[PDB]
Design a protein around this ligand. Sequence first.
Ligand code: ZN
Ligand code: ZN
Ligand code: ZN
Ligand code: ZN
Lengths: 75, 75
Amino acid sequence: SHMCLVCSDEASGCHYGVLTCGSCKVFFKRAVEGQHNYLCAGRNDCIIDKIRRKNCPACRYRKCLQAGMNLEARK
Amino acid sequence: SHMCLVCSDEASGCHYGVLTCGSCKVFFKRAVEGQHNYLCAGRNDCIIDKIRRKNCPACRYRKCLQAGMNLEARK
DNA sequence: TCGGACAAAATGTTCT
DNA sequence: AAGAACATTTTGTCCG
Ligand SMILES: [Zn+2]
Ligand SMILES: [Zn+2]
Ligand SMILES: [Zn+2]
Ligand SMILES: [Zn+2]
């Protein structure tokens, strides 16, 4: 009820359509708006938790999108 | 040879006993001088190349050790 | 070579 | 729920 759905950290509230923490909220906006081409170094199935969420932006971003995060969600 | 044995970027010379780039040189020094309680988000065999070497410090440090890097290489 | 200082990228928190 | 500003962590380059 107060776990980030992306990294399981303590969730602040609902951001861009999904219960997430502050760090995943800002990560998501940066991933969408910025140009990076994230690439997984594993098997496209990395564990994303409070510690490990720094280790694979590709899998973190993929999880944000799959949980349904969207920038224009207030519309 | 002219390629870093850890990440396959252009090597800048032989550092801590091994042909490596400057980024792997300082990454290793920082890991050995400091803490290196890193956690892999995959299965401890992450691919370490020029872009993905940022992803997993745990597997990067393992690759430095496996290549034989050591601080007292000189003396 | 090795390492300090500087610089940049990447991530996270506070405040409105 | 959203985003600007700041702060920290992590990484990489220069060394007129
Ligand atoms: Zn999160
Ligand atoms: Zn991954
Ligand atoms: Zn390297
Ligand atoms: Zn790994």
